[PDB]
Amino acid sequence: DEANIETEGMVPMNRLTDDPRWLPAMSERVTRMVQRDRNHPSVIIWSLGNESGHGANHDALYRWIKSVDPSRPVQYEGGGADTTATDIICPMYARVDEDQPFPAVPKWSIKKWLSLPGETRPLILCEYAHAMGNSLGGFAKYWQAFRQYPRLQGGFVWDWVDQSLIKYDENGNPWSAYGGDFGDTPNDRQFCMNGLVFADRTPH
Amino acid sequence: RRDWENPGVTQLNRLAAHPPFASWRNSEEARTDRPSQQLRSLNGEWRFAWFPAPEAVPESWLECDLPEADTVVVPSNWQMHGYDAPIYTNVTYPITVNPPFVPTENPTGCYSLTFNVDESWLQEGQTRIIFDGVNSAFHLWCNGRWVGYGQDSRLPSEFDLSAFLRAGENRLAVMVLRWSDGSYLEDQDMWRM
Amino acid sequence: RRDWENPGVTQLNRLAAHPPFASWRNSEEARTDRPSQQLRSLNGEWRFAWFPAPEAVPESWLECDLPEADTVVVPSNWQMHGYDAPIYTNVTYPITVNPPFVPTENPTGCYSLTFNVDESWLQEGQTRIIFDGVNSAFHLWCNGRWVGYGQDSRLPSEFDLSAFLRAGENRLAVMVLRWSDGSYLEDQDMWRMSGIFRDVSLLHKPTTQISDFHVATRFNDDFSRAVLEAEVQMCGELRDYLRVTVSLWQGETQVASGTAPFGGEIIDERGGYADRVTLRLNVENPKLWSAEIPNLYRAVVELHTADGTLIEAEACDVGFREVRIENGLLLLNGKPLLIRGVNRHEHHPLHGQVMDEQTMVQDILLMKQNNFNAVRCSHYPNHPLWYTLCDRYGLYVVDEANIETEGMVPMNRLTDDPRWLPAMSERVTRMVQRDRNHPSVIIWSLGNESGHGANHDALYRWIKSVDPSRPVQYEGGGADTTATDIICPMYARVDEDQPFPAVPKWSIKKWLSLPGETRPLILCEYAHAMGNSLGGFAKYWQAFRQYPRLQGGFVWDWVDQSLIKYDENGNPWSAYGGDFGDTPNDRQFCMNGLVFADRTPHPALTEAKHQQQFFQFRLSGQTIEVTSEYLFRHSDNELLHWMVALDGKPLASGEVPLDVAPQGKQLIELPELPQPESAGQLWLTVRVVQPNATAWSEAGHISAWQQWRLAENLSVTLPAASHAIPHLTTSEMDFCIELGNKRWQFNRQSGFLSQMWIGDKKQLLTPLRDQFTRAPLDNDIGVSEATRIDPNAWVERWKAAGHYQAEAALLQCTADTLADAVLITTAHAWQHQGKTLFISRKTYRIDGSGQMAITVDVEVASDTPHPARIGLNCQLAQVAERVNWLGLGPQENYPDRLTAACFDRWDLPLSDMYTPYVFPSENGLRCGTRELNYGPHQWRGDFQFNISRYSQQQLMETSHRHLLHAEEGTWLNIDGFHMGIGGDDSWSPSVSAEFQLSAGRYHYQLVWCQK
Ligand SMILES: OC[C@H]1O[C@@H](O)[C@H](O)[C@@H](O)[C@H]1O
Ligand SMILES: OC[C@H]1O[C@@H](O)[C@H](O)[C@@H](O)[C@H]1O
Ligand SMILES: OC[C@H]1O[C@@H](O)[C@H](O)[C@@H](O)[C@H]1O
Ligand SMILES: [Mg+2]
Ligand SMILES: [Mg+2]
Ligand SMILES: [Mg+2]
Ligand SMILES: [Mg+2]
Ligand SMILES: [Mg+2]
Ligand code: NA
Ligand code: NA
Ligand code: NA
Ligand code: NA
């Protein structure tokens, strides 16, 4: 269960989440989610949101959930996937054997990540295997690794269904449309279609 | 007094969040998770009118239905009804990055509903309304009188209407703003509706 | 649209909090911390009008001054101006508890000010206004137009007036609401006031400005090297030609300096802060900061262009110090501290809660002079100047957020409610952003008495993320919750547990070793100094010194919160709860200081100074061993001063310079001390003296002292029998002994000495009778009131038992003649409703030398609350100017608070034998007295005493010290035994067992005579 908080557009990504002036707005998107869904057994982990760097607000809210509900682990990939605001190393798109040494927020090979000096948490990718179009190549490698490494406990494929919308031509026939197809601009082409199934739930 | 441009105001008169309620008046119904008489759905056909900004919303609307309005189904996204286009942007915000300000031209959706309340609901207890999802912020009026405000498109906003409702016909006025300071926290890579 | 009744709205258009700014336009002015042209003060005479509610404020006011208004000084509290009464309530909220709603009748103060702005301020840059303190919420208008709103009475609210001001005359309209939803978080046990009580300023900043800067100092393991890290953030137009240069100054010297363009390091996938830059300067062998030696540097932040043009400069004092809790201990620069602290409310007897430099410096000097090294901002951020002073004078500070809700039920009803997370958040975060650069601030506190809710944990973690340099603490919820790095109880006793459910107060010694516990323990409040208190104080320190992890505490508290009123004649007097028509009120519970509102020391302050000494001494024959308790300084401004005296009579003395390294020891070999001859007790007395004057001390200031009973010579040569012999005359109603000039009369109907004569001069105005009660001390009363009685309080236990109204029944009264003296034998039985409470057997022996030897032997029922005292008393007829005695003094001292007192010959004016506690009670006692001299009289033995013009009765019937009237003659209370005063807290029996008159059978002997 993930709070409604993404500010990936800001620069740096945590410009709001680290600003105490925004602690209130964020607070309510975390606390109200917990107070609402905390009784569902299917909810096993709480997430503080998505792509919003790592600000103090995240740490504050992290600790809140831990105080309010000890029954569930909290996780957050912002700021490098292994920040003090997450109980699980939850990177997104970190490869199996290859490192991607980005400054500040690198994506280590998931196998190398688990054994980094001092690290001890379990690692579950919050997003991996971008299924955009003819994709999912190398998927078997992830699982090979998941099964061999005790602390490599899986992940969440990205993602389920294509975010395509239905439009109609002059004849009144339906067709799948994406970025820009509605006069929307600026738009991000077809990047809204990353599913394992088409908008109409037909398997890829 | 623009509330959609102040991250300090995320709600006004909204009740506290909580687990799913149904207020059964019979334990057997509760155990079997059967429908509840105390939980009515206001889904269906509502009255809708699109505007270029909240400042274009005619006062009359608060008390009297606009004839220029259309009857549409709720819940729904007005983009899907063709009132304006749905935008698809990944990272780059759909609006200009200048927190906590949003465009002066803020697509405002005016939803209204005439429905009646059983007299027994007003003779006792509390009668509240629950909006499970309003994108991205909105103001609520019940019978011309103002009730409250709410933000956060993905969690329910609840308000106590007990003192606004009357037995019989009642009318809801819901001014929904497409953009708001809350949009700064809603930058997910999906269609922006 | 009521904003004062919505905890979701705590401000409107208020600018971001930040370290103190001045916007210097000259780097030299910044470095030298000289006044700034860009920082004007709007303090002075303003226009004020009071209203019953905001709804009564006439619109005209927004644009036109009300003629009905008055001209008053700002800052100030309108209660202090008499516009309405200041309320004094402890826990119970001053308003009705119904969050977030406040009374419809909300006292609204309307402040206005006409002032003009230089045209140059409006031609460029930003012009903002700064309200350092508005109690408790307010709306601001500039020239009729509305600007913003603000809450939180203890932190500054800033608004950008740039677009509201015009060149020339301008007018400010400030509507201040006394009550608001914010009042729910401001329930501290102090006078409840309101208004603009802190400075109002006008700051001009360039458009492209410095909007914030954080100073950090990290060292290597031995503090030989240190790296100063300065993160700077800007606003306005970003340009490459922009630069920031942070330079560190040690006096006129420039130890280091760094320059760099904006553009921080990459922090995440989106890059970094292009509007920030961090400078890192190296510092070799830095001068470390401490309360011992407040070594400071000057950090100057300059916003300029690459071509060298200064845009603006900001600065602050920097103190290189490292605070960290390691292995269970709180370390300051690697050494484990011993907090000799005190809690200090911002209170002025005439100005209400308005602070000024003078009052501050005064308090600071007094504190340091009485060996204090730390202070707790109970219970809200203090006036900005305070931190600056503590920085320079040297004081460890606990900066505490403005959050107390002790009135709620349960105490954490709000702090655990996520709906209130926002309001709380701002009272914590804004404090940190403001004071985080002050080196004197060593610990952050989350507030006071507000239970333990999730909000506390959330905010706890925030500070830890934002500022790793300081430990966070909070006593709420049991003092050892997950929201505190330090076990910080309040009033937890030394050896005795107080097993309260949920939130017990364990013996501080037992607390440290509780299974799993490992943190350091520092009481945030202990030794409630209310009235005649601080008994058992020495026990705390004994323990602090023995236990590594018992690192001190903060006494409660500094100054009495009494206000000055005037009677018909126009004379000033100290007033407290209720004295202003305020009700409900909490009596005198606002007076818990070590000093009176006017900073005059209480007797207890002296005890504190002594127990908190930084030099410990031990004696072994001829050698005195001095151990230093300092962690950094050397005793480079001290010399030991010793002196031997036989029962007051000095014999030898001298002085050795002190050369002790911190933590070190020094041995001092006294010369072959003078060999006494006469009978008596030799007393070695050492005093540490500061020859040179400091910034806080006069020259020759005394920082410590200690006494030792050297040798003793019991007198064996009993008196030379005079040939005269007393004559006994006998009536049926009296026994009269005459000897030369003197005449003694014992009323055979009472069994007490009813009168004595020295010529045709009477000596007593009231018979010499036994006494087992005392004018109840605040600690004896606790929270027991007229209507609400606390059956547990000592005063009630006594009352119920009947001690205050015991009829003295005579059992025997005989007289016999001896070979050289008359002998009167008495025996009384004090009872109440049949129950025999006390029995007092005595024998008076008047001999040829004309000396009366009174021998008392009392019995106390082993099932009647232990008596407050066991002695005698009578109203003498004389009224002398001085009092001389050989015993513990010079100041007031009681059994459980007499360590600081010294044994010697003391002489003082009758008045100094009376302690002016605002709330009258037993006082002025002096223990361990072998000789007392008053007028023609002299009493000898081994007793305690208090002598004044007020009877115990008057004292216990009078509520204020100003309603006390001198009585005929002088009342003498001579105790053979006196119960301790206690004080571990003032709301429950707090007198240690060893100080309770429980022996059952007591015995003392006195010798009355004419000197
Ligand atoms: O479709 C590309 C994806 O990239 C991820 O980093 C992001 O978290 C997803 O929400 C989506 O934007
Ligand atoms: O003397 C009563 C004291 O009790 C303390 O618990 C409180 O923190 C103080 O502010 C004061 O109310
Ligand atoms: O602060 C702790 C205690 O302080 C006392 O003054 C008060 O009477 C008690 O009820 C409790 O509040
Ligand atoms: Mg808003
Ligand atoms: Mg994204
Ligand atoms: Mg408010
Ligand atoms: Mg209190
Ligand atoms: Mg001692
Ligand atoms: Na997508
Ligand atoms: Na210690
Ligand atoms: Na008090
Ligand atoms: Na010296």
Short mmCIF file of C-alpha atoms in Angstrom, two decimals, chain C residues 15-303:
data_model
loop_
_atom_site.label_atom_id
_atom_site.label_comp_id
_atom_site.label_asym_id
_atom_site.label_seq_id
_atom_site.Cartn_x
_atom_site.Cartn_y
_atom_site.Cartn_z
CA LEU C 15 8.07 33.54 5.33
CA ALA C 16 10.35 30.58 6.13
CA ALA C 17 12.15 30.36 9.49
CA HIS C 18 15.93 30.86 9.47
CA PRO C 19 19.04 31.80 11.49
CA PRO C 20 19.32 35.44 12.66
CA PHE C 21 19.78 37.82 9.71
CA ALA C 22 20.93 41.44 9.48
CA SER C 23 21.68 41.76 5.77
CA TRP C 24 24.93 43.67 6.19
CA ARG C 25 26.11 45.40 3.04
CA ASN C 26 29.63 45.61 4.42
CA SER C 27 31.64 42.51 5.37
CA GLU C 28 33.54 44.40 8.04
CA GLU C 29 30.35 45.30 9.85
CA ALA C 30 29.32 41.64 9.71
CA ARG C 31 32.60 40.32 11.12
CA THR C 32 32.47 42.79 14.00
CA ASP C 33 28.78 42.16 14.62
CA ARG C 34 28.03 45.89 14.50
CA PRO C 35 24.51 47.33 13.92
CA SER C 36 23.04 47.00 10.44
CA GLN C 37 21.49 49.80 8.39
CA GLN C 38 19.23 47.19 6.79
CA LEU C 39 17.75 46.21 10.15
CA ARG C 40 15.47 48.80 11.76
CA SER C 41 13.57 48.34 14.99
CA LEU C 42 9.90 49.21 15.16
CA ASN C 43 9.91 49.13 18.95
CA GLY C 44 8.56 52.12 20.80
CA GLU C 45 5.18 53.79 21.17
CA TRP C 46 2.29 52.17 19.33
CA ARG C 47 -1.47 52.67 19.28
CA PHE C 48 -3.52 50.15 21.22
CA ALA C 49 -7.19 49.45 21.87
CA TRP C 50 -8.68 46.46 23.67
CA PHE C 51 -11.81 44.60 22.51
CA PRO C 52 -13.99 41.75 23.94
CA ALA C 53 -13.77 39.73 20.70
CA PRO C 54 -12.46 40.17 17.16
CA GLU C 55 -16.06 40.67 15.98
CA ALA C 56 -16.06 43.98 17.89
CA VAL C 57 -13.18 45.46 15.92
CA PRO C 58 -14.54 48.39 13.82
CA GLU C 59 -13.54 48.31 10.15
CA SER C 60 -12.40 51.95 10.29
CA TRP C 61 -9.46 50.70 12.38
CA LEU C 62 -7.92 48.95 9.38
CA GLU C 63 -7.34 52.25 7.63
CA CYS C 64 -7.85 54.95 10.22
CA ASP C 65 -6.47 55.14 13.76
CA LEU C 66 -9.12 54.86 16.49
CA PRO C 67 -9.15 58.05 18.61
CA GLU C 68 -10.37 55.99 21.54
CA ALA C 69 -7.01 54.18 21.38
CA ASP C 70 -4.11 54.80 23.72
CA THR C 71 -0.42 55.14 23.08
CA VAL C 72 1.50 52.28 24.66
CA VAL C 73 4.99 50.79 24.53
CA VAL C 74 5.79 47.75 22.44
CA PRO C 75 6.80 45.06 23.09
CA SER C 76 4.59 44.44 26.13
CA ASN C 77 1.71 42.37 27.52
CA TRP C 78 -1.57 44.26 27.67
CA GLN C 79 -2.36 42.55 30.97
CA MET C 80 0.64 44.45 32.36
CA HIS C 81 -0.97 47.63 31.06
CA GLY C 82 -4.15 46.80 32.95
CA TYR C 83 -6.39 46.29 29.91
CA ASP C 84 -7.51 42.94 31.36
CA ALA C 85 -6.28 40.49 33.98
CA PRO C 86 -3.37 38.06 33.60
CA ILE C 87 -4.46 34.54 34.56
CA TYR C 88 -2.46 32.07 36.58
CA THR C 89 -3.38 28.44 36.13
CA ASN C 90 -1.07 25.40 36.33
CA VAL C 91 -2.45 22.38 34.50
CA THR C 92 -6.11 23.17 33.94
CA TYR C 93 -6.45 25.07 30.68
CA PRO C 94 -7.42 28.78 31.06
CA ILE C 95 -10.22 28.22 28.55
CA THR C 96 -12.77 25.44 28.07
CA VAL C 97 -11.24 22.26 26.70
CA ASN C 98 -12.97 21.72 23.38
CA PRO C 99 -10.38 21.60 20.58
CA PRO C 100 -10.03 23.37 18.32
CA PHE C 101 -12.56 25.91 19.59
CA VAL C 102 -11.90 28.92 21.75
CA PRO C 103 -14.26 31.26 23.71
CA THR C 104 -16.50 33.51 21.62
CA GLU C 105 -15.38 36.22 24.02
CA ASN C 106 -11.75 36.30 22.95
CA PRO C 107 -9.78 39.33 24.26
CA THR C 108 -8.50 40.97 21.10
CA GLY C 109 -5.67 43.48 21.24
CA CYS C 110 -5.58 46.00 18.39
CA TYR C 111 -2.06 47.34 17.82
CA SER C 112 -1.28 49.93 15.16
CA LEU C 113 1.80 51.90 14.12
CA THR C 114 2.42 54.81 11.77
CA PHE C 115 6.04 54.94 10.64
CA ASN C 116 7.75 55.84 7.39
CA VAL C 117 10.01 53.93 5.05
CA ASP C 118 13.05 55.34 3.26
CA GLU C 119 12.42 55.63 -0.45
CA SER C 120 15.60 53.62 -1.08
CA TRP C 121 14.07 50.54 0.54
CA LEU C 122 11.25 50.54 -1.97
CA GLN C 123 13.38 51.14 -5.03
CA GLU C 124 14.97 47.72 -4.76
CA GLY C 125 15.17 44.44 -2.92
CA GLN C 126 12.86 42.95 -0.34
CA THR C 127 11.47 44.75 2.72
CA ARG C 128 10.00 42.47 5.39
CA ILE C 129 8.63 42.85 8.91
CA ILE C 130 9.55 40.57 11.81
CA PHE C 131 7.44 39.92 14.92
CA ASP C 132 9.61 37.97 17.38
CA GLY C 133 6.67 37.21 19.61
CA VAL C 134 2.91 37.60 19.47
CA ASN C 135 0.75 35.82 22.07
CA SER C 136 -1.06 33.84 20.84
CA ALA C 137 -2.20 34.46 17.23
CA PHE C 138 -2.67 37.48 15.00
CA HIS C 139 -3.64 39.03 11.69
CA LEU C 140 -1.53 41.69 9.97
CA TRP C 141 -2.58 44.56 7.71
CA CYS C 142 -0.34 47.10 6.04
CA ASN C 143 -2.00 50.29 4.86
CA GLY C 144 -5.50 48.89 5.06
CA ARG C 145 -4.54 45.90 2.90
CA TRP C 146 -4.28 42.44 4.54
CA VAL C 147 -0.86 40.74 4.67
CA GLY C 148 -1.00 37.47 6.61
CA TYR C 149 -1.64 35.41 9.75
CA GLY C 150 0.50 33.73 12.39
CA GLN C 151 0.52 31.39 15.42
CA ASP C 152 3.06 30.09 18.01
CA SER C 153 3.76 32.76 20.64
CA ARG C 154 7.43 31.90 21.02
CA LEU C 155 8.95 32.00 17.54
CA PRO C 156 9.17 34.92 15.08
CA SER C 157 6.67 35.45 12.27
CA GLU C 158 7.97 37.24 9.14
CA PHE C 159 6.04 38.76 6.23
CA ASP C 160 7.17 40.39 3.01
CA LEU C 161 5.79 43.96 2.97
CA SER C 162 7.56 45.02 -0.20
CA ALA C 163 4.31 45.37 -2.14
CA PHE C 164 2.34 47.07 0.65
CA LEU C 165 4.68 49.86 1.66
CA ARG C 166 4.90 53.27 0.04
CA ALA C 167 7.64 55.87 0.46
CA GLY C 168 6.88 57.98 3.53
CA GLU C 169 4.09 57.40 6.02
CA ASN C 170 2.79 53.83 6.34
CA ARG C 171 0.44 52.23 8.87
CA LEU C 172 0.43 48.78 10.46
CA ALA C 173 -2.70 47.15 11.83
CA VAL C 174 -2.10 44.11 14.00
CA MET C 175 -5.08 42.26 15.45
CA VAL C 176 -3.82 40.01 18.23
CA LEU C 177 -6.10 37.29 19.58
CA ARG C 178 -5.49 36.18 23.17
CA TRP C 179 -6.89 32.70 22.55
CA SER C 180 -6.57 30.47 19.51
CA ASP C 181 -6.31 26.80 18.59
CA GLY C 182 -2.60 27.29 19.16
CA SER C 183 -3.41 27.87 22.84
CA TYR C 184 -4.00 24.14 23.09
CA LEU C 185 -0.27 23.60 22.66
CA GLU C 186 0.63 26.48 24.98
CA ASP C 187 -0.50 25.17 28.37
CA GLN C 188 2.63 25.88 30.40
CA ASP C 189 2.40 26.42 34.16
CA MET C 190 2.94 30.20 34.03
CA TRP C 191 0.98 33.45 33.92
CA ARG C 192 -1.35 33.37 30.89
CA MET C 193 -0.89 36.67 29.03
CA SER C 194 -0.96 38.02 25.44
CA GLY C 195 -0.01 40.76 22.97
CA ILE C 196 3.16 41.75 21.09
CA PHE C 197 5.72 40.92 23.79
CA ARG C 198 8.84 40.63 21.63
CA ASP C 199 10.69 43.03 19.35
CA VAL C 200 9.26 44.07 15.99
CA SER C 201 11.73 44.62 13.17
CA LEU C 202 12.10 45.72 9.59
CA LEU C 203 14.72 43.91 7.50
CA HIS C 204 15.74 44.77 3.95
CA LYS C 205 17.32 42.02 1.86
CA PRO C 206 18.58 42.21 -1.74
CA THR C 207 16.39 40.51 -4.33
CA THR C 208 19.19 38.02 -4.94
CA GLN C 209 19.80 37.12 -1.30
CA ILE C 210 21.11 34.61 1.21
CA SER C 211 18.01 32.78 2.40
CA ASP C 212 19.62 30.32 4.81
CA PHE C 213 22.91 28.87 6.09
CA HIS C 214 23.89 25.94 8.36
CA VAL C 215 27.18 25.77 10.28
CA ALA C 216 28.70 22.43 11.27
CA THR C 217 32.01 21.48 12.92
CA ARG C 218 33.40 17.93 12.87
CA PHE C 219 36.70 16.89 14.52
CA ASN C 220 39.21 14.04 14.50
CA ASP C 221 39.42 11.78 17.55
CA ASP C 222 41.72 14.08 19.52
CA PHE C 223 40.21 17.39 18.44
CA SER C 224 43.50 18.49 16.89
CA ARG C 225 41.82 19.08 13.52
CA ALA C 226 38.31 20.19 12.66
CA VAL C 227 36.40 20.84 9.47
CA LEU C 228 33.88 23.67 9.38
CA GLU C 229 31.09 22.94 6.93
CA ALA C 230 28.79 25.76 5.83
CA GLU C 231 25.77 24.97 3.64
CA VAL C 232 24.43 28.14 2.04
CA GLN C 233 21.13 28.60 0.18
CA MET C 234 20.06 31.58 -1.95
CA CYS C 235 17.00 33.12 -3.58
CA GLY C 236 16.43 35.39 -6.51
CA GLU C 237 18.00 35.32 -9.93
CA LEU C 238 20.61 32.59 -10.26
CA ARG C 239 23.67 33.60 -12.29
CA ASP C 240 27.13 32.07 -12.79
CA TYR C 241 28.89 35.25 -11.75
CA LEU C 242 27.41 34.58 -8.29
CA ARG C 243 29.66 33.42 -5.46
CA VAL C 244 29.61 32.67 -1.74
CA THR C 245 32.67 33.06 0.46
CA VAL C 246 32.63 31.72 3.99
CA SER C 247 35.50 33.01 6.11
CA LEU C 248 36.36 32.02 9.67
CA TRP C 249 37.69 34.70 11.99
CA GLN C 250 39.54 34.30 15.26
CA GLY C 251 39.56 37.87 16.50
CA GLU C 252 41.34 40.03 13.92
CA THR C 253 42.95 36.94 12.41
CA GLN C 254 41.47 35.03 9.49
CA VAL C 255 42.04 31.33 10.25
CA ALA C 256 40.47 30.03 7.05
CA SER C 257 38.39 30.98 4.05
CA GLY C 258 36.70 29.34 1.11
CA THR C 259 34.91 30.60 -1.99
CA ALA C 260 32.76 28.76 -4.50
CA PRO C 261 29.91 29.33 -6.98
CA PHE C 262 26.38 28.00 -6.37
CA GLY C 263 25.67 24.45 -7.43
CA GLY C 264 25.60 21.73 -4.83
CA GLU C 265 26.61 18.12 -5.24
CA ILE C 266 24.37 15.58 -6.95
CA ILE C 267 21.87 14.29 -4.41
CA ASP C 268 19.51 12.17 -6.50
CA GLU C 269 18.42 11.19 -10.00
CA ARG C 270 17.24 14.76 -10.74
CA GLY C 271 20.62 16.32 -9.92
CA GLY C 272 21.23 18.73 -7.07
CA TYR C 273 20.46 22.11 -5.54
CA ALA C 274 21.62 24.70 -8.05
CA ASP C 275 20.55 27.31 -5.51
CA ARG C 276 22.96 26.09 -2.81
CA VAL C 277 26.66 25.54 -2.12
CA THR C 278 28.65 24.06 0.75
CA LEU C 279 31.98 25.42 1.93
CA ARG C 280 34.41 23.32 3.93
CA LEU C 281 37.24 25.01 5.83
CA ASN C 282 40.03 23.23 7.67
CA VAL C 283 41.03 24.27 11.15
CA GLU C 284 44.13 23.02 12.91
CA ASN C 285 44.23 23.00 16.72
CA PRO C 286 40.90 24.78 17.09
CA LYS C 287 39.93 26.58 20.30
CA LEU C 288 37.10 24.39 21.58
CA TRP C 289 33.90 25.86 23.02
CA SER C 290 32.46 24.92 26.41
CA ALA C 291 30.67 26.52 29.35
CA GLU C 292 34.09 26.49 31.00
CA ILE C 293 35.80 28.39 28.20
CA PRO C 294 33.40 29.86 25.61
CA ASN C 295 35.96 30.09 22.81
CA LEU C 296 34.22 31.57 19.77
CA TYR C 297 35.09 32.31 16.15
CA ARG C 298 33.20 34.52 13.69
CA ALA C 299 31.78 32.99 10.54
CA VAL C 300 30.99 35.50 7.83
CA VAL C 301 28.86 34.44 4.87
CA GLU C 302 29.26 36.73 1.83
CA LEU C 303 26.99 36.68 -1.25
#
